[PDB]
Symmetry: D3
């Protein structure tokens, strides 16, 4: 497929999503790195976002709750190049009704080549990377060329 | 779960999506009903939308191709109350890589209670219904009450 | 895929299926439209069918409960051309153990091109449509030609 | 889950289903055991059934092709107690569009407790087992009691 | 796809796995056949294995609980040719979080052509088969040839 | 669910897995990072591992091909604490027959809390992270306590 590049801004647009049983996990993680996270732009699904801002006083752009469409709203933003990092703590030990939304979101984050963390270890490694606050060139599919081929 | 209502406008915002093997079907359907479709607002995923406007001269707000995120863009619009009708001709005889996106979109259309057609027969029945060109009231989940309960 | 046609009779054979959390929703819908439904032939999965007839006094051909095979019984009828309309209020906010049966049923209804409603809004639009009470042709795959090709 | 019993007849009603890439395998298996299979009642999905009878001259009750509804027809028969054994050689190395039908069929065969073989080794072990040719009692869910509980 | 053969030893390596709602049924099944099972090598996922040995005093090589990776441990053993029979009583009436692990395990058991039982009826037919205690040859994919083709 | 900790060694055990259409991407990534990868222990699925060592001369512990059980072998290793990092470039634009194995592997990597990369951007961020060469303490589920609760 045709690939091109896009530049992740120094100031990243970060999406924070967590399933109910993983919310405390994300909360702690966020509080632990608040000083650094405050330097970026935060987005979150409904419940997650509200809990975060209510607890840290940080400004979070909250979307709809995941089951109500929040996951697809985030997915859409990712495909539009408006989200640069996804921290998605999904529950691997509980079945969720919106499982297709979960898999769809992770599929898009993989397609659009943005840094994704699905557990604390990966989140820590990503946020501690030296270039987390630098602009970095990532390869992304060349949509214009892709569409032109379909037509 | 508390329910509330929303009014579908007389002029509907229609999303048109079709998997490759079902594109000719959708095309024909759109052309045969062009006179009526011209009175509403059309949205479509990347390839579908371009094929439609290129063939009917109708104005279609094209989003990204489905596999690249178009299905989730439509889903987001539905959940935001910006899409009133979904005509999704998905292929039931072929496995698609973005199957989760397909299922997720149909799940949201079901949750938000908007008219959905996944085959020609259903599409025809919906577009021929008397209140298709009228303002119709639909029951929808009361999100505010729903969220307020989660943050209790 | 060569297509052929089949005629949906004026008096439709309607299958009514509802997941547990969506049962009250279907009940109300059925009661509100009883005068019209009274004019057609009703089929339903085990629990759903019994609740309907017990509440409306309408005659419903009940099949097995969905989890026990009812969804596949309905699917089989659809493929045999014995079901003309499917009203399936499945729960989009709860994971069901027989999810494959659910998806398989919706897949067949799509393949055989019969009117399908998965929510109240769609159900209302379909039942209020002019040809709901008329005999009307629908295009369907030409099975004979399809099988002949596989051999 | 109240349980009851049902008796599998000596002459079994056998469903034979195979995905395209596994058809030659089923054919060989059927031919190898034709003498024994000829004593029972055979059912199959559309293509599989026709290939078998055309090759062995055996009488097979063919249903619709799997993708067109054949798997659900077999599933329905199983739940109605009309199928006693299922030989389903599904392809574990290829994605099929009707995957939900495949999983649904296997789920029903598991629920109704009938012998099921998804590969040759299991098929051979089953067909060589004593009770394959005798009548035997199996436990099955007590549906009447199950339904009575749902309407209480 | 090239096939070759492997010989299941007379003394089989049996994997016993059961979802919570199906544990009592597996327990009864095991106790009911203890005399025979005592002649073979038993493996099981964490909880299942501990319950069995604690109740029958039989020696069971317990792996991790299924949700924590046990199903994949068993799957790995099967692909390595270290498991000859799989008795997997999965719950067809309850959704499990590790559903992909379940399907993956059954997919591998199908690919590697080993006897598999997902319900009591199939388990009984397999364990009563004459050759359950004999060395028996099964057709398995020829991996060496398969890999050589991918690296050609 | 109680938690405990485990220490990822300075010298990491890295699993490298790539679907066919993503193999060239992984190859390039490995070559550009060879100097660093050379200091750790590499594992890979069948085809991937062989292509890597054949091209870089690096020593890779190759397991079975993914469709033949390789993904479950890796998953088993992860659950046993023998894999510390997973670089899995799965294809999001193509349907794979062993999709359940794919999802199962990613589910286990999530459960056991090890660094996981599913695309180049994430892989780059992880390998450039300060502690990639240091011993790091990760929180993992306390299995002993977890099992003890199931056996209560």
């Amino acid at each position: 497929m045709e690939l091109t590049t896009r530049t992740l801004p120094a100031r990243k647009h970060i999406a924070l999503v967590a399933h109910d049983h993983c919310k405390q996990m994300l909360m702690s993680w966020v509080e632990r790195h608040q000083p650094l996270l405050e330097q970026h732009v935060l987005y979150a699904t409904g419940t997650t976002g509200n809990l975060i801002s209510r607890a840290t006083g940080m400004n979070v752009n909250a979307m709809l709750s995941g089951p109500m469409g929040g996951d697809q709203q985030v997915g859409a933003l990712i495909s539009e190049g408006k989200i640069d990092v996804l921290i998605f703590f999904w529950d691997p030990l509980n079945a969720v009704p919106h499982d297709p939304d979960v898999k769809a979101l992770l599929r898009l984050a993989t397609v659009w080549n943005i840094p994704v963390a699905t557990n604390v270890a990966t989140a820590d490694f990503i946020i501690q990377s030296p270039h987390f606050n630098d602009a970095v060139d990532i390869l992304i599919p060349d949509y214009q060329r892709y569409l032109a081929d379909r037509l």
